[PDB]
Amino acid sequence: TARTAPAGGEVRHLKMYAEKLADGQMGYGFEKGKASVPGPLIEVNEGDTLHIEFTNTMDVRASLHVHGLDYEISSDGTAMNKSDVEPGGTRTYTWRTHKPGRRDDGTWRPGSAGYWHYHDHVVGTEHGTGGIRNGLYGPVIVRRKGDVLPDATHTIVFNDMTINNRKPHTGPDFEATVGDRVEIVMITHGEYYHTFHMHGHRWADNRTGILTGPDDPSRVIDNKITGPADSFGFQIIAGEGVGAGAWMYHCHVQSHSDMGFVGLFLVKKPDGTIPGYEPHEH
Template sequence: MSGQRVAGDAAKGGVSRRSVLTGTLAGLVAPAAMSTMTASAAPGAPGAPGASGRTRRITMYAESLPGGQYGYGLAPGEATIPGPVLEMWEGETLEIELVNTTDRRLSIHPHGVNYTVDSDGSPLNASYNEPGETRTYVWSTQTQYQAGSGLWMPGSAGYWHYHDHAMGTDHGTEGVRKGLYGALVVRRKGDVLPDRQFTVVFNDMTINNQMAPNAPVLEANLGERVEFIAIGHGDMFHTFHLHAHRWADNRTGMLEGPNDSSQIIDNRDLNPGESFGFQVIAGAGVGPGAWMYHCHVQFHSDAGMAGVFLVRNEDGSLPDGAQEALDRYRDHQHGGHANH
């Protein structure tokens, strides 16, 4: 299941994952919210004046889905697995009104941003939605700031995620297993925004709660800037591997200059609770085609933890051999044996 992109002030490009965008840095494309820090103090620091007052307010709906699954959506009847990409700019505050349309206790808990105990999303702090209840969760972000003695405190920018923390157990184990999760991206001023954006979640032995040959086929045209947001959930060790494309192992996945010594990788651990993101130029140096992405733990990929990154020709047409590759993927008997 997937959603579509929804922008706030401005947007461009075809993005496969629904996103939320706002702020004066818009006009670039990215789900988000934004604000700037004051010159003298850092938002979130003790006694700091906080951001410039920019607050983004959205409503999300937690809904039951077919097959006993659940999802988050931005409108009634639009819940997906994963949920919509929520995106902010450093310094911004995001207020989320969560409407629980289900008959189960659930919540929304973020990684990487600031929140009070009332917005923790955990039963420990009595922060959750009862069946049918509407509750507001408030997340804030901060820019980098100098803490003294030449040291700096980090900002909130990064590829994070959100998930349920209340269904089934006080840790939301059932909610996460059944699809209540999504990507949270915090941008820094000057970050490059993508043409297309995909969320890939390794959840137990599934990808976005699906297995091959039904795992997502992610599509882009040759030369487009594509952003991957990778998230790990469940109880198992995984690695994320993307064929024919590589990225820098840092915050953005891109080198900051010719002397940036960040390691260039095409495979990275993706364990429960971990998340990272990166951008690639689709087909750069390798051309269009059906490129695999998968868990590189061998018995995991054999069992169906594999999908396809389909890079079409620049005009959107299928490149030679791509349809045949897709047919092989869909016809493959995962579990270590082929049909033929």
């Protein structure tokens, strides 16, 4: 039987930094000197509270703003609400999450669970256009009790024309073995719409990307249109019914894929081999 998320409700503390990278980009990290683009994954259970002690190490104002989760206005990360951070300064942002449940009026309160993201809101413009462009974004996962847990989670961000702020024809590639349970967090940012496509695999267009049983009528898809600040996620069994292989993923807007914004889901046999893929050639 698969591993499932437990009941949430813990108070968690975390340290985060925004830093200026040597190449001109901007990144978040849990440790000074280890910023990354995309920023590190934040994963919690519904009911958890997260206190993020955030330090802006840059020479310009920056902030941390989150989609989906609960936060008071003092943590929305905007200049308007006095919620951003001065150069060199520190601020504690508080994000909360809640379980679903019956309200007193008989209606159903939705829970926080889902695939979300955080990003800057004050670098370059008052909507963080420069910070987002430079790499100040990252994924957030909120698990409902009983959600299936993966072997591994990969984050794919279509940021303007780039994937994860990388140059054309440099992936990123991800690797799995046939049978691995692989999770994908898909995020889009910037100016353009895109269509995310994966070869050889498919998922359900609902909250978790998977179907619990025969009664769920959601569309099963391998192609999905997205726009700036859209986020969704899903799980696949690597190679299920299709075998090992170098399975492309890409934006399917034809000029975008033609520019080289493509990557590989390298699904291996146990011996590491991939049919039709020769390592000493890529």
